[PDB]
Each structure stands twice: as structure tokens, then as C-alpha cells.
Amino acid sequence: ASVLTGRVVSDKMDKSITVLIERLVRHPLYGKQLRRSTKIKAHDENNVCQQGDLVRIKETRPISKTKAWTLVDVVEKVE
């Protein structure tokens, strides 16, 4: 439905990971695209992925106070 891709910058929570999604939001006056980033905490039920991995996360019903996304696929892993 609504899937998002980004790296894992933290995984030191039980059944939870922090995902850093990058976007290029363009300045509304000067036209240069600035690469910004937001930290989205997703839910990793089995707690398998570590930090530094590519993960797809989809929006779902909230699982915690500040957690409403869940891990669906780990396309890439730390080298």
C-alpha cells in the first residue's frame, strides 16, 4: 500500500528499528534540491536486521507511542 525504503541507523530496541529515509525536498525559492532525512521507528517482530541494512517498511496501525511502521523486506545487508 505505502512502502518506504531506508537504512537502519539503530536497532537497540526490542522488536524495533530506527530507519533513516532520505528525500530531496526542493527549496521553494532557490530551486536547489536539499537532501533531508527523517528517523522512522519500525517494528521488526523477529528482531533480525541490524544497523546499516536496507529495509522496506510499510505504514500500518501504530504499535507503540512513536512506532507505526513495520519491516516487510530486507533487500540489502551490511557488507
Binding site: 527549496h27 532557490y30 530551486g31 536547489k32 536539499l34
Partner: protein
């Protein structure tokens, strides 16, 4: 002033403050005269210009210029003060409105009557 420098700091123009702070963005304010004196203008020219120091309802106490030939203002006279500075007078940025509340219109005015609160002669 590169593109990267503009999306970091950005042009910041500065707005000028009001030249008539006592009015508080109002067209006119009423006040009470605490002193009605005369003073001398600056270097280039000479005269005895009539000035009234008035305490306004905004909490400011400024000096306004009584324009016209003759007036009837004393202490505790209730006057309307508008904006507009007098170039020759240092520290006078307001004009008293003639005909408004206590200030009378200029007695024998004929041409610019509405600027001096004078009724049309019959």
C-alpha cells in the same frame, strides 16, 4: 552569494520602524496639552514656531506642531494629534489637528480651510 550559501542563510531584508511611534498605527490620537510653548527652528531659517507637548492616550508624551496663524491652546487642552514631522523642528514628528476637539480652526482662513479646520464662510 552562491546557491548553497542562499539556502543556508538566505536574504534577510529589514523592515523600518514607524516614524510616528506614539500613534501606535492609528491615524490620530487624542491627548492633553502639558505645555504650550514656542521654539526656534534649525540653522537655515529663523522663526518662533508654536509647539505643544501633549500626553497621549497611548502613554506617550510627545510634542506636536500647531500649524496656522494663531491658536487657543493652553495647559490641559484636549487635542487630536496626527502624524507628519516638521523639518525645521528637531524632535517634533506630529501635527495637532485644527478644529478637532479643543483646538479651534484658524480664525480668518480662506483658501486651505479644511487643512486648518475653518468652516466655509457665508
Amino acid at each position: 552569494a552562491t546557491t548553497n550559501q542562499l539556502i543556508r542563510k538566505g536574504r534577510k531584508t529589514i523592515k523600518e520602524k514607524s516614524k510616528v511611534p506614539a500613534l501606535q498605527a492609528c491615524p490620530q490620537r487624542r491627548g492633553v496639552c502639558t505645555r504650550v510653548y514656542t521654539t526656534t527652528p534649525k540653522k537655515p531659517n529663523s522663526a518662533m514656531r508654536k509647539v505643544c507637548r501633549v500626553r497621549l492616550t497611548s502613554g506617550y508624551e510627545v510634542s506636536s506642531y500647531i500649524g496656522g496663524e494663531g491658536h487657543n491652546l493652553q495647559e490641559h487642552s484636549v487635542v487630536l494629534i496626527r502624524g507628519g514631522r516638521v523639518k525645521d523642528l528637531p524632535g517634533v514628528r506630529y501635527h495637532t489637528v485644527r478644529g478637532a476637539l479643543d483646538c479651534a480652526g484658524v480664525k480668518d482662513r480662506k483658501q486651505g480651510r479644511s487643512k486648518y479646520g475653518a468652516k466655509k464662510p457665508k
